[PDB]
């Protein structure tokens with residue numbers, strides 16, 4: 378039942394709306410990634426809200442959790458698309474925004490792109506299952522909270538704990554075995570922790586970009602600028618931190 382829902386609520390394809398006839402320029406490429414961010418967020422909000430047990434969380438916590446976790450959530454799914462599609466050779470941000478080494482450079486994001494490409498690579502190196510992925514992605518929504526807890530921190534802990542048990546559940550079967558089960562869970566929880574440093578590098582990047590957006594001609598859509606100037610700082614100043622397994 379858990380998996381039927383995750384499989385059922387999983388978002389479809391989201392295009393960034395990039396003009397691929399115009400030259401790659403920092404401004405263009407980043408305005409596109411931002412718009413894509415605005416579009417994908419609309420879908421993350423719907424998905425999250427349709428997550429089993431999600432409604433147990435307090436209304437403000439529901440929103441807060443989405444607002445702190447979107448970067449890692451989008452980065453993780455983006456790595457999956459790059460994987461199932463381009464076998465991790467390039468970053469499949471959208472069907473109309475697939476970065477090559479040249480785009481990775483002309484974006485002043487080469488490094489972060491290397492790390493995300495590296496993540497996508499892990500889905501391969503580890504042979505991640507579509508279902509392990511659905512579960513791992515679900516748990517990333519419950520992977521970053523304020524240091525002083527949320528309004529109803531007891532519902533989040535319940536919720537989060539349950540998602541950890543489903544992850545172990547979907548490996549403890551044919552998706553693990555012999556001496557795998559223990560090793561399999563150590564590597565998946567290790568792969569999950571890996572998305573966090575990558576998310577933080579992008580948080581600082583996007584934040585700096587937003588402060589000087591008017592000068593590099595890159596513009597951030599409504600929700601992006603608001604969430605980047607209201608929520609992301611709380612993360613960057615240490616008020617909200619990721620939950621690490623290791």
Ligand SMILES: C[C@]12CCC(=O)C[C@H]1CC[C@@H]1[C@@H]2CC[C@]2(C)[C@@H](O)CC[C@@H]12
Nearest residue numbers: 410411413414417451455470579583586
């Ligand atoms: C979440 C997004 C948008 C959705 C996606 O597939 C990947 C991804 C990772 C890079 C983010 C991007 C949104 C726009 C950001 C935050 C830029 O300002 C700098 C890094 C970009």
